[PDB]
Structures are given as C-alpha cells and as structure tokens.
Design a protein around this nucleic acid. Structure first.
Lengths: 135, 50, 98, 212, 134, 72
DNA sequence: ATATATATATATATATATATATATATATAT
DNA sequence: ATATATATATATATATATATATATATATAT
DNA sequence: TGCCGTTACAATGTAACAGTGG
DNA sequence: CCACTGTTACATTGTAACGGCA
C-alpha cells in the first residue's frame, strides 16, 4: 500500500460516484423490480450525510456489474488526489494528431518504454545536441 | 428554555471543536512539510553551488 | 500538533470531516462550502469554510447578554444560564406541586 | 418538474398561507390591527414566516414592518392596493398617554390593569384641558355637558384603539383594559434623540405619519 | 465556415448541455426569483425533442453570461463531430508527467511551434540522426 | 401542503387586485374580461380559498362572481 | 334619547366517521 | 352426527364538526 | 467586431498491465 | 495462486485564449 486509504473520504467518493451513475440513468441497483430499485436509491440519497452506511448500501443493493469500475475509479481518484499536492508529481493532459501519435507510439513500442520515457529520451537527445553545440 | 439552551450550547461546542480539529491539523501538516522542504532545498542549494 | 506526522493529521482531519458531515447536513450553503473545501489544490478554502462557521455561530447568539460574539466565549455564559434555570425550574415545580 | 409547488411559490410561503392561523391574522392585519407579544401563537407564526409574508404583502404595495419593540404591522404605500387611513389628533393624545402609562412606574400597583377614568385623569393632567376641549366642540367653555362629551369621545377612541390591538379589554370587563407594546409607535417621533422637525420630516417621508 | 451546422443535431446538443448544467446546479435562467427559474427550467425539460423551440427558449430565458461558454462548447462539439469520422483527422489524448511536459512546452514556446509541430520536428531530427549514423 | 392549481391561481399577477375588490364586495361581471376569465378558470379553488374565510364564492346565473359572507 | 349596526355566545339540527354488539355461514372438535 | 369458534356483515348510537338562528350588549348617530 | 476554427489545457472515467503480499 | 494497488494510455466533455475572416 503506497497511498493512505481514508475512510470518510473514499466513502464520500463512492457515494458521489453512485449518485452520479444513477442520475446518469444507469441501474446501480442489482434489483430488476422498479420498486425495490427506487427504494434502494431513495435510501442511498438519504445516505448523503452518512458515507459510512454507503458501504452497507453497497453490500445490500449495488449492481454486481460495477465492482471493477468502482475499485478502478476510486483507486485512480486516490492516486490523483495524492499526486495533485505537488507539481512535480502532477500530470498534464495533451492532445496529439493521429499521424504524430502513430509515429510516437510506434517508436515507444519499438523502444519498449512508456510515452513519457520516449519523450524524455527524445528531448534529452535534442538537449544533448544543444549542449555539445555549447560545451 | 432549558432544552433550547442545552441544545444550543452542545451544538456550539461540537461545531467549534470539530472545525478546529479539521482545519488546524492540515494547517500544521502543511507548515511541517514546508519546513522540511526548505531544509532539503538548502542542502541541495549548497551542494549545487560547490 | 507540531509533533505528529502527516498521516495522523490526515486521519484525524478525515474523522473531523466525518463529524462535520453530520453537524452540517442541515445547512445548505455552509455544507456546500464544506464540500468545496476538500480540494487539495486550494487548501485556503478550508480556512474560508472555518470563517463561515464562525460567521454562522455569530448569528445564532440569542440575546444581548450572550453577545460575546466570540462563540467560544458564549459557552460559559450559557452554562451559567443552564444552572440558573435549574434553580428556577426547581422553584417552579415546587410551586406547581403545592 | 411540473405539478411542483416550487414552480410558482416557495415552499414555506405556501405552507404559511395554508396554515389555519393565516386567515384570521390576515383579516386582522388588513383591518389595521397590530400584533404584539401577547398573541403568542400569531406572534410566533409571524416570526417563523416573517420574510414570506413581507414579500407576499409587497404584492399589495404595503410593507409588513416589525418595529424594534417586536410588534408587526402594515404600512401602506401611496400606491397601496389596500386602502390607508390616519388616526385623529385625539387618538394621538390618548396613544401618547397610553405609552406613558406603559412606561410610568407610579401606576405599577395597577399591575397593567387600567380604567378609562384613570386614563382621562392622566390625560387632563398632562394636556391643556380647555384648549384640548376646543377640538371636541368649538363652542366649549368648560361646560360639564361638553365634559361628558369629551369623556365619551375618549371612550370611543379607546374602543377604536382596542380594535387596532393597542389595548385589550379584560376577558369579562369592557371598562378595564391592559396596554400592549404596540403603543410604542406613538413615541416614534421622540424615540430618536434628534430635532423634532427633522424626525417629523423623516417619518412623513417614510410614510409613517401624515400631517393634518 | 468550415463545418456545416445541422439544427436537429446542434439543438439537441444545446438542450443536453443546458440540462447537464442545470443538473450541476448552474443557474440556466436570468431570473433571480426561484419560481420563474423553476418554471422556465420545467418548460425546458418538457421542451425536449424540439430544436425550433429550444432556440426560442434560449432567446427568451437564457442566462446572459453562459452564451459564450455554450457557443464555444458547441464550436468544439461541431469540430470534434466532423473530425471523428476519419482516422487522420482524429485526435489522440495523452497524459504527460510534469517535468517532461515542462521541458517539451519550453521547447515549443521557444520555437514558436505547437506541441504537434514541435514533437514532429524533434522526431524528424531523431530519424535524421539515425540515418546519419546508418 | 397546498393544492397545486390553487397555488397557481394565487400566484397569478391578477390575484392581488381581484382579491382586494372581492373583499371589498365588488361584483365581477363579464365586462372585466381578464378577471372574469381568471375566475372561470380558477373557481374550483378560489371557492375553497374563500371558504377558508367562512365566505362563499358565488357565480350568479347571470354569470357575475361575488362573495357572500357567512355569519362566521 | 332612542333607532340601528356590529360582535359575541349559545342552542339546535345536520351530516359523517367510527366503535359495539348481534346475526349468519363455515370450520372443526366430540 | 353433533355443537362450538371463527369471520363476515349489519344496524346501532356515539361523538364530532358544521352551519344556522336568536338574543345580547353596546357602541353610534339623529 | 462577431463568428469560427483551433490549440492546450482540466477532470473524470476505464481498461489494461505490473506489482505486492498472504 | 489469488486478491488488491499502482500505473499508463487512452477517452470524453468542457473551457479559455488566439487568430483568421466577413
């Protein structure tokens, strides 16, 4: 375990995720009957200020589909929350044109390294050229 | 009147104590890490200058 | 708190937030401020929320004698008033019995 | 969504207007009746939904106003949808006297229960007997018939103020009464330590008091 | 004008955007009074499946300050919609670690090129170096 | 709570003037097009609203509306 | 000095909701 | 093969809330 | 200018892989 | 083995800022 797990924060995250999914129209409940699903959703809504019971609501009415997406989303949210503290640990999102991305990805799988590592090697070669021009 | 005053006092006590607990801890945490980062940066700076 | 480390501070802050969730569900704007305060990218928000808390309890003062706007100050006056009320209650119940 | 109260009205205003106390309070208010601390139920109702009722009555171009003493009432505007009226000068004399009795400790033994005779005695003590009588009848010169007429006029004005809620007759006696905090409005021209002629202009500008 | 604008599509986009914003708590309408805002929002909700009237609804009840954001969101939606048909016109989104991004952007502002242009030039130079050696 | 259509009728901007004129005893005939149409539309609820005041909202055979006060 | 309008209280009748006790049909023990 | 217990339906009547009408006090006005 | 394309981001959600410890 | 965690590489949508163009 590298990231501290906080219960009262991850529980709130989970509740918000469930509410977002439902309001998006998805069937968070495991119930096919409309009435039981509605009752479970209403109770979940009441659980707004009690994130602790959200775990129990999960164990009682959460759709079996969502375990993987849940554990993925909350894991990623935890990682991002802990990384956002410092800039040097932050991430920057950029968009690339298809030809450029195609060439870059081909180069990276050729070198067997991540995109950031490939960019590091490339920019380092350019900066090495600049340095040798300078010395 | 007794009921109302008791509720008010309890609410005030709880709110104040919890708000202080919630905020001051993160404040101290940040202060501590800022101190630590400064300490580390000075060593880096000295080594760099040499 | 200077002595402890980040982990304990974070854990107890999480516990304090858990208490707050209950203590704040009634309020709407203050609850919203509490929710906003959780962003790690803007710690100052936390302090802002704290200010609001005071700026809330300040208005909950009842009458002139409790106008020690410092909320922590009003507690003692209120406790004194509770004791006083205890005595008046005793007198009134005796009156009613007779 | 449709069929939803918030579509048209705030929830609390609708709840207040559907409350059993709303109609009697509204009828009394529109009649001009002031509300004091004594009507605990009505006073508490006003406190709870004070804002809803001020905004509601704003639709009538009339301000629901709570004096610092804590008694609510209505002040119509020049464009009032509900008519407006002004008290008589004798009404002012009697209202000022009632404020005095409310604040007067000498009569504390009365314990708040007063008779019209005592009110008349105090009124004549502080006011100008004959020059005040001049208003009752232009041809008065101290005649006891006109004296009885003035007493009767004072009684009629007292009844009217009772209608306005400034005074309550006792559950069984219409010859004895208890004063209410609403009477403080009669001192609004002197509650502020400033020049009387400026307070008068301020008040008339506020619509609080017209001249004669 | 490069992309032709289609009403039954862009109007649905606008309706969905406004509904999303309202669900997010944004004040869609210019009415401070809650009743009028709620009534207009309900009209909008029942206004689904209508371009020619959602446009009018926008003209009549829309919040003044969101016009630009909605306009630019629709611009981006249109451009993405037209570009997502072909592979060469699509765009690939990636995440870069902060130091790497800082250096790459440093190069891009220095040279006046865009991220795509800067990376293309750098890769081309790397390829050229390979060819020099090879 | 409150009936929804009653709430709609009260909120209508015509309601203050019409209410004042009714409480003043005025009779609303066919000449007052807006008020008469409003009353036609919302009678089912204004009758209840004014029955809360122990008054009856009566539509005469001629058509004009008015308020009849009860003893209470 | 007395006619008249207004507010208040009481009795009286209406109408509705509801609990109680009995009668009837069926079930089940002897 | 019989008699007792259950559930159902019904009228009774009990109480409440409403609405009406009359008497009263009494405050105004001629 | 006012629209319109365009870029460079931000925030969150997912799938997939790699690690880690029991 | 097995589960849970950390990480990368996207997608998806929104936004602000430039710059082109009538």
């Amino acid at each position: 375990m590298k990231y501290q797990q906080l219960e009262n924060l991850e529980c709130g995250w989970k509740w918000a995720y469930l509410i977002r999914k439902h309001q998006e129209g998805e069937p968070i409940t495991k119930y096919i009957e409309n009435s039981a699903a509605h009752a479970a959703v209403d109770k979940l809504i009441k659980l707004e200020s009690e994130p602790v019971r959200v775990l129990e609501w999960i164990e009682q009415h959460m759709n079996p589909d969502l375990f993987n997406r849940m554990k993925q989303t909350i894991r990623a949210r935890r990682k991002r929350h802990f990384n956002a503290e410092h800039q040097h640990t932050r991430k920057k999102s950029i968009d690339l044109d298809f030809p450029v991305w195609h060439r870059l990805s081909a180069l990276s799988q050729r070198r067997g390294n991540t995109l950031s590592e490939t960019i590091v090697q490339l920019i380092e070669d350019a900066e090495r050229k600049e340095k040798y021009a300078n010395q | 009147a007794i009921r109302v005053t008791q509720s008010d006092r309890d609410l005030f006590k709880h709110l104040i104590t919890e708000a202080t607990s919630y905020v001051s801890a993160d404040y101290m945490r940040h202060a501590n890490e800022r101190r630590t980062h400064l300490d580390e940066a000075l060593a880096l700076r000295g080594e760099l200058f040499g | 708190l200077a002595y402890m480390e980040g982990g304990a501070l974070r854990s107890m802050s999480d516990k304090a937030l858990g208490a707050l969730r209950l203590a704040v569900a009634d309020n709407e704007h203050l609850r919203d401020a509490l929710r906003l305060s959780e962003d790690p990218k803007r710690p100052e928000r936390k302090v802002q929320f704290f200010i609001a808390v005071y700026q809330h309890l300040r208005e909950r003062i009842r009458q002139d004698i409790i106008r020690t706007d410092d909320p922590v100050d009003a507690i003692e006056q209120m406790e004194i008033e509770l004791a006083r009320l205890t005595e008046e209650l005793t007198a009134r119940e005796q009156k009613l019995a007779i | 969504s449709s069929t939803h109260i918030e579509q048209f009205m705030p929830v609390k205003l609708a709840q207040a207007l559907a409350n059993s106390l709303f109609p009697e309070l509204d009828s009394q208010l529109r009649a001009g009746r002031h509300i004091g601390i004594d009507d605990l139920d009505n006073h508490a109702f006003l406190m709870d939904f004070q804002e809803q009722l001020e905004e509601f009555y704003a639709r009538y171009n009339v301000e629901l106003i709570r004096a610092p003493e804590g008694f609510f009432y209505l002040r119509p505007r020049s464009t009032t949808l509900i008519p407006r009226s002004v008290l008589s000068e004798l009404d002012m004399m009697v209202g000022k006297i009632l404020c005095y009795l409310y604040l007067s400790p000498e009569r504390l033994a009365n314990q708040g229960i007063f008779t019209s005779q005592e009110l008349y005695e105090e009124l004549i003590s502080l006011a100008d007997e004959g020059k005040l009588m001049k208003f009752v009848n232009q041809r008065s010169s101290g005649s006891d018939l006109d004296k009885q007429k003035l007493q009767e006029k004072v009684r009629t004005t007292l009844n009217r103020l009772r209608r306005l809620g400034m005074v309550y007759f006792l559950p069984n006696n219409n010859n004895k009464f208890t004063i209410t905090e609403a009477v403080f409005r009669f001192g609004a021209d002197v509650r502020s330590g400033d020049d009387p002629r400026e307070i008068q202009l301020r008040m008339i500008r506020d619509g609080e008091a017209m001249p004669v």
